[PDB]
């Protein structure tokens, strides 16, 4: 079948920090448009596991970026929403395990998404205040 346990995870265990495998894996997810909320719950759980390091979170971070962008483009609103719904908490947690350097890279990706208006400006404020709380200072 097109679905199986941890298919998303084993994917991220094969991805690299660049658009080659990242965009390819994104297009797979963009074809799972029917199952977008299902794959989204697997995405958050995958990176929420500490059974994977910040490097693994960084791959999935780039993967999400290109997935939500393409979904925003055509008409796969289910994906930009399904990832946007978890993005506030999820990205908010990445800031709690990333070194300041990866936090800056993540922040840029988040900004680029905000500028592209990928998520709703409402969901953006959820991500913003979440990452803001995850600045570890106030």
């Amino acid at each position: 079948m097109a679905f199986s346990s941890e298919q998303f995870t084993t994917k991220l265990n094969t991805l690299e920090d660049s658009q080659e495998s990242i965009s390819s894996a994104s297009k797979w997810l963009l074809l799972q448009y029917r199952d977008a909320p299902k794959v989204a719950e697997m995405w958050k759980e995958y990176m929420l596991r500490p059974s994977v390091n910040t490097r693994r979170k960084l791959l999935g971070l780039y993967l999400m970026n290109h997935v939500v962008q393409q979904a925003k483009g055509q008409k796969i609103i289910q994906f930009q929403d399904s990832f946007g719904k978890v993005a506030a908490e999820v990205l908010g947690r990445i800031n709690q395990e990333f070194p300041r350097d990866l936090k800056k890279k993540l922040s840029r990706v988040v900004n680029i998404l905000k500028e592209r208006n990928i998520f709703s400006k409402q969901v953006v404020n959820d991500i913003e205040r979440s990452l803001a709380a995850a600045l570890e200072h106030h």
Binding site: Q19, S23, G73
Partner: peptide
Amino acid sequence: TSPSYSPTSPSYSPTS
């Protein structure tokens, strides 16, 4: 593979 990458360059409205 790990070619060049800048998250502001890839798709956003590539097709309907």
